[PDB]
Design an enzyme around this catalytic site. Sequence first.
Site, mmCIF file in Angstrom:
data_model
loop_
_atom_site.group_PDB
_atom_site.id
_atom_site.type_symbol
_atom_site.label_atom_id
_atom_site.label_comp_id
_atom_site.label_asym_id
_atom_site.label_seq_id
_atom_site.Cartn_x
_atom_site.Cartn_y
_atom_site.Cartn_z
ATOM 1 N N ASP I 19 0.650 -1.304 0.064
ATOM 2 C CA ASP I 19 0.029 0.063 -0.204
ATOM 3 C C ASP I 19 0.780 1.292 -0.186
ATOM 4 O O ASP I 19 0.348 2.286 0.364
ATOM 5 C CB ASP I 19 -0.901 0.165 1.293
ATOM 6 C CG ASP I 19 -2.028 -1.079 0.903
ATOM 7 O OD1 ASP I 19 -2.393 -1.183 0.113
ATOM 8 O OD2 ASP I 19 -2.730 -1.583 2.077
ATOM 9 N N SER I 20 2.184 1.208 -0.591
ATOM 10 C CA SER I 20 2.691 2.391 -0.907
ATOM 11 C C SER I 20 2.439 2.895 -2.390
ATOM 12 O O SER I 20 1.604 2.011 -2.877
ATOM 13 C CB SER I 20 4.247 2.506 -0.917
ATOM 14 O OG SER I 20 4.684 2.368 0.618
#
Lengths: 51, 49, 97, 263, 45, 66, 48, 44, 144
Positions: I19-20
């Site tokens: 989830d970067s």
Amino acid sequence: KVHIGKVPIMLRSKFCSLRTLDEVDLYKMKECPYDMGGYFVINGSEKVLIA
Amino acid sequence: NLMGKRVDFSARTVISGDPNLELDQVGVPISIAKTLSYPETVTQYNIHR
Amino acid sequence: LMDDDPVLFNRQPSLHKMSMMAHRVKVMPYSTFRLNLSVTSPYNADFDGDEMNLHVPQSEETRAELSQLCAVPLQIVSPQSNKPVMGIVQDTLCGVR
Amino acid sequence: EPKVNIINAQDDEVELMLSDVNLSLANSLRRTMLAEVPTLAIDLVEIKMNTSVLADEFISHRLGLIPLVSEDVEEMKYSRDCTCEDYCDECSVVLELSARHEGEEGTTDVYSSSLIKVSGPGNLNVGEPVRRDDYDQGILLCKLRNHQELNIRCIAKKGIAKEHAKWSPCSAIAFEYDPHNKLKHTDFWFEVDAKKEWPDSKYATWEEPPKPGEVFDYKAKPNRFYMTVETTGSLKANQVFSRGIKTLQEKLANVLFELENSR
Amino acid sequence: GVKYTCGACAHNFSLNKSDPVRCKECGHRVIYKARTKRMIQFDAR
Amino acid sequence: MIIPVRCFSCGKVVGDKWDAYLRLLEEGKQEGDALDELKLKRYCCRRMVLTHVDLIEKFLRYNPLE
Amino acid sequence: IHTVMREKGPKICAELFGNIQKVVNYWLLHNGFSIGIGDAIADASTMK
Amino acid sequence: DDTITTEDCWTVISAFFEEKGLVSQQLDSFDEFMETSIQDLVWE
Amino acid sequence: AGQNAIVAIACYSGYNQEDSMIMNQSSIDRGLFRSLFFRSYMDQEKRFGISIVEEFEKPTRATTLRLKHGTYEKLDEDGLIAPGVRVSGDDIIIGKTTPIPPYHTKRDASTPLRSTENGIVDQVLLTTNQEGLKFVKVRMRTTK
RNA sequence: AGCAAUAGGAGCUU
Ligand SMILES: [Mg+2]
Ligand SMILES: [Zn+2]
Ligand SMILES: [Zn+2]
Ligand SMILES: [Zn+2]
């Protein structure tokens, strides 16, 4: 007529002073036409009652 | 206050991922690196630095 | 704070001894903390809002304790199930396949 | 050995085929034109009176994003290499904007054509905001009502797109090669057949499709590159291309200089 | 002394710390200070 | 708020096209044709102009306080 | 990982993570990997 | 007469919102309060 | 309350894992997801008695004590900063003094800026409260 | 060279 107290007013209700004043005067009173009301102003702070 | 307490010399911020760091490396922001500190006794091997 | 200083790094909740581990410092811009991606499993962390805490040891005894007991390389194998807890994850696995 | 074949050429864009060059060269040229070709853009804004509804840094961002004529910007100096204190005449261009709405009806639009060049290293042809035509009104900057006023002194300086996008002379550098996938550099995702499901490149008719009897060639490298440079009017397309080439040449010459003078 | 402005009637004036807070032209209740005289620079980024 | 000068994705100048786009919309032309005539061919540039909401008209309606 | 940990020690096992990550990340950067709406679609016969 | 389509339903819904808006419950409750409730509390 | 960004789904360089997400610096430079921030500080004068009240005023060092560690050089003669002035963290934006009950007889009750925030003063309002004592609201502005 | 407390409410990551 004894004064028994002050009742806060719900904005955009029948007793608010913004209920009249179609869009032009709303603009002159610094009020956003998208603002729908439904809240109170206590000490300059908007308060909403949760059901 | 006895089993747990607030402590000095700590920091907190959001974490990010870095494929180019080693496993036992952590990237520390410059501002935190300057706010936090370590006391290093002066000796005859580290006086110039 | 300088490069290679051992610091204790921690995410809550700290459910097991590998949720708080000692890391070597590398100073960087851009105010987030940076982690190698294989250590995100023992912390149970991801990068969608999480924050983690950093504790700086203030003496040499605590530096040595961190580096010789809590260091990340020393926690790869866990006593919980006598298996590794750090692996290859999340894009390196797909790419190596 | 390198060859150029221009296919379309107007002031803002040039479409050209590049051939007999390595892919690294073509990609380095694309990157240089996108990022390292100097232009002129407003880098310092001075607000005297801003009573418009828009905020000061909003207007400053918009003014910095205004393309300015940069034909002669290469004969100019970077403001970090001049001996001068607060901007002189030779490393900066000073612009003025004065706008005001009088009356109680209507809205006065403030356009980029209203920017006025006051000083600058004459007689260099730099500084003016770019107009598309003689009758162009330019870019929209702000809007003004009764008694609202805008009084701004902008400074323009030389910079490249690495530091900030407002110095980019280019919008989009279209770039492709090998329309028929003869080199097998890609591997087409498909459901039933990869030939039916994928649209042809716009330069497909520029190269012969592979014959069914043909076998794969392991000697062929990419050799023809079709790229379409577009500009924002700050520089012309031929100027962007030639100065990208020159910037790359001077970067290589800098490397060579450091190597030789490191002995 | 220092310049102020009405919030309702846009009147400009200047008060000197001892009169009450009020407008001359209309007499309204809320006033805003005026913008400074110094020069402000922005980076245009 | 007000039309951005550049396209976010690629950087084409779209700030000089909002008025032309509105004029194209008055005589009945649909949005795709108007965007075609303004020579916005990449869908990044197209969505720059197609999705702009002009709020400065609403902000300008409150009387200037100076 | 367990084998390298047990035979070579914690340092070499730690460096193994970095070596594999770097090599595979470079290869995937220059290869590419994506996912789209088409990767969830089965053909007509499978739908039947 | 023809078959009511989805767009007809959205026309009906637009009528609903044109009448009531999104905070009509608050406003109607407070209007009822100030019209009747205060007087009834005084006469309780 | 958003912007239509152009999004690719790819394992590009490994900086978008777990989830970067990689964002274009040039698009940020051209104004993508750029926002204004407004912070408003409030303060007023209280009445502790008959003739004992607070005052908005730049507190001079001689007559005042316990002055904050920020700089006071930005207040006008009325104890108020003016709109249009750059302000850093720990800087005073509303100077106020509280009298010492029975020279050098005053303590300060000034409101500094938050130690984290930079910005530019936008709108310094001045009125009176319900009880007729002076009332000040100061709206700051910045860009994130 | 010195930046209150107590509460309630809304949120962040598990
Ligand atoms: Mg998380
Ligand atoms: Zn100079
Ligand atoms: Zn007035
Ligand atoms: Zn575009």
